[PDB]
RNA sequence: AAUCCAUUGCACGGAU
RNA sequence: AAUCCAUUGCACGGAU
RNA sequence: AAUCCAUUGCACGAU
């Protein structure tokens, strides 16, 4: 009923400022989130259905959990980050 | 009146999505909060003054504290959870 | 970058500007003192300082618990917006 | 049950 | 590219 | 003092 509550390698961030372009958004997300552990990748698209959102894929679940708990609601480009766990494993995680 | 930050066995959650019925709310709250320690009870009522709200009663204060620090603002049925400590001991805790 | 790096001081903005300084400082101490010892709470109502406060904790763990636990929580009908101070408070920098 | 009005409320309502 | 309109969206748009 | 306009700002105007 609430699979977005289940710890995952990947955190799902939405309510992101949609004026930020892909390169700056990924650089900023990497600078903020890398103190929680090794990031495998950050997935951002600016298409209609994907804007305002990012998937931050951590090597370790423990890093994802500490990232979500620490950065929940953080004011980022004038908007509080909204963070859940990804509903399903990112392909790069499932592949391992 | 300020948010209550004095630790207590019980956490008081509001800003809950009032479309979720009592039995599903309790089941979903149990699934989220059981990772912080042993839950003694979850009190939900749908009366006028009690809807949007839940009391989660932890066996140890340490579990409430971790629950509040970790799940504050968690996007739960499209609304960020607002978590304080309960102002006063729940009855199950008081007769202990 | 630095506003996301733990610091002794938390920076709060989006505060209800109608709250006067004494009640704001007393209310912020009641909220934040439960996370650990507070060295100081700096509030000014000047044009550039209003809607904002700096809460200086003795230990960084207190500031981290405070920011994580109270992020977004409504205060005088406005969600508190909490970051780490970009630079150490003078009282910390001196210590 | 459902839709609608109203309710942000610290505990152990109204309409079709 | 920019501007305006629309979009809060769980993945691996329209107009000058 | 109260109110209106303006200000979302990282410090150590009007009756």
Swiss-Prot record, chain C:
Subunit structure: U1 snRNP is composed of the 7 core Sm proteins SNRPB, SNRPD1, SNRPD2, SNRPD3, SNRPE, SNRPF and SNRPG that assemble in a heptameric protein ring on the Sm site of the small nuclear RNA to form the core snRNP, and at least three U1 snRNP-specific proteins SNRNP70/U1-70K, SNRPA/U1-A and SNRPC/U1-C. Interacts with SFPQ; component of a snRNP-free complex with SFPQ. Interacts with IVNS1ABP (via BACK domain); the interaction is indirect.
Phenotypic consequence of residue 13 to V: Abolishes RNA binding
Name recorded for this polypeptide: U1 small nuclear ribonucleoprotein A
Residues bearing the modification N6-acetyllysine: 58
The RRM domain, residue ranges: 8-87
Compartments where found: Nucleus
Outcome of swapping residue 14 to V: Substantially reduces RNA binding
Entry function: Component of the spliceosomal U1 snRNP, which is essential for recognition of the pre-mRNA 5' splice-site and the subsequent assembly of the spliceosome. U1 snRNP is the first snRNP to interact with pre-mRNA. This interaction is required for the subsequent binding of U2 snRNP and the U4/U6/U5 tri-snRNP. SNRPA binds stem loop II of U1 snRNA. In a snRNP-free form (SF-A) may be involved in coupled pre-mRNA splicing and polyadenylation process. May bind preferentially to the 5'-UGCAC-3' motif on RNAs.
Mutagenesis / variant outcome for changing residue 11 to F: Substantially reduces RNA binding
Effect of residue 9 to V: Abolishes RNA binding
Similarity comment: Belongs to the RRM U1 A/B'' family.
